[PDB]
């Protein structure tokens, strides 16, 4: 769905031996807070000896894009499971917000590698601050000075079944 980025902060349940346990934070892309908390325990159980029954959520807050109307180049590191084995992958996405870039990432993985949501882990999303650090040619071609391109063969949508003249594809 349309993803939102949440920060989720959790802890182990305090006891008499260890009052005030350590706080752990991570950033989760999810469509709503219910899924976001579910994903938090999914990754925490892969890193520390804890689960939902023996822990609690401290706070969950939505994180907005600082400059949502600025074009940014993103580098994304992902880990996904194919039909046989697990692989690491680096991809680059151009967009105006992290949530928009993540949406493209899930669509790209499903289209090119048939990887569903359950088979993908987003390791890191980082904005590429400097040009010449972009290492994918399908992104670099949009970084040239005075970029211009036409849109040949325009197709117009017709609201009526029949048309009384041959249409043109000029643009």
């Amino acid at each position: 769905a349309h993803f939102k980025e949440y920060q989720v902060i959790g802890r182990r349940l305090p006891t008499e031996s260890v009052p005030e346990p350590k706080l752990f934070r991570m950033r989760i892309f999810a469509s709503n807070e219910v899924i976001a908390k579910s994903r938090y325990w999914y990754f925490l159980q892969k890193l520390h000896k804890v689960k939902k029954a023996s822990g609690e959520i401290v706070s969950i807050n939505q994180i907005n894009e600082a400059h949502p109307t600025k074009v940014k180049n993103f580098g994304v590191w992902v880990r996904y499971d194919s039909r046989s084995g697990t692989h690491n992958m680096y991809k680059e996405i151009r967009d105006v917000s992290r949530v928009a870039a993540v949406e493209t990432l899930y669509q790209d993985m499903a289209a090119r590698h048939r990887a569903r949501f359950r088979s993908i882990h987003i390791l890191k999303v980082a904005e590429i601050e400097k040009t010449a650090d972009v290492k994918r040619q399908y992104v670099k071609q949009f970084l040239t000075k005075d970029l211009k391109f036409p849109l040949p063969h325009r197709v117009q949508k017709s609201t009526k079944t029949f048309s009384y003249k041959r249409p043109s594809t000029f643009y």
Binding site: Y138, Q141, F142, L147
Partner: peptide, 8 residues
Amino acid sequence: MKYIQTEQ
């Protein structure tokens, strides 16, 4: 990869 423009 759908190159933007190729020229000869």
